[PDB]
A and B are shown apart, each in its own frame.
Chain A
Amino acid sequence: FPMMTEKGTFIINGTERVVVSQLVRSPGVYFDETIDKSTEKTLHSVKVIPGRGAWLEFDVDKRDTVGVRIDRK
């Protein structure tokens, strides 16, 4: 198992390397609001985004009827 030196590095096949840290978006439920284009109407949305699985999204449209999409279908 490639181990890690006291300096914060790894040594791979002789060369010294560094595993940088990645910025990402956290899993969770993320709401929104996007002024509509056709009608200039507010309309909200949510989105549930885990590390693994399918994307489940709900919305409120201009017809004022809530809706859902599963696996972005």
Chain B
Amino acid sequence: EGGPGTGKTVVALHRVAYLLYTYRKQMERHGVLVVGPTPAFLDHIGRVL
């Protein structure tokens, strides 16, 4: 929980990368479920993921 103008989404994505590398052995056969409010935002995510 942050606010506007602080890049919380990019940070969350970098966090997910760190986790999926570190623990790439319990994951890597499960996935990463990313919910969002709109498919526009979801394509944005998929695009800078």
A interface residues, Cβ below 8 angstroms from B: 39-42
Contact = CB atoms under 8 A, between A and B. Distances in A.
B10 to A, nearest CB: 29
B31 to A, nearest CB: 10
Interface of B: 29-30
Instruction: Please classify the interface of chain B as helix (H, G, I), strand (E, B), loop, or mixed, using the class held by over half of its residues.
Output: loop
A40 B31 CA distance: 12
Query: Top 5 nearest A-B pairs by Cβ distance?
Result: A41-B29, A40-B29, A42-B29, A41-B30, A39-B29
B38 to A, nearest CB: 29
5 contacts: A39-B29, A40-B29, A41-B29, A41-B30, A42-B29
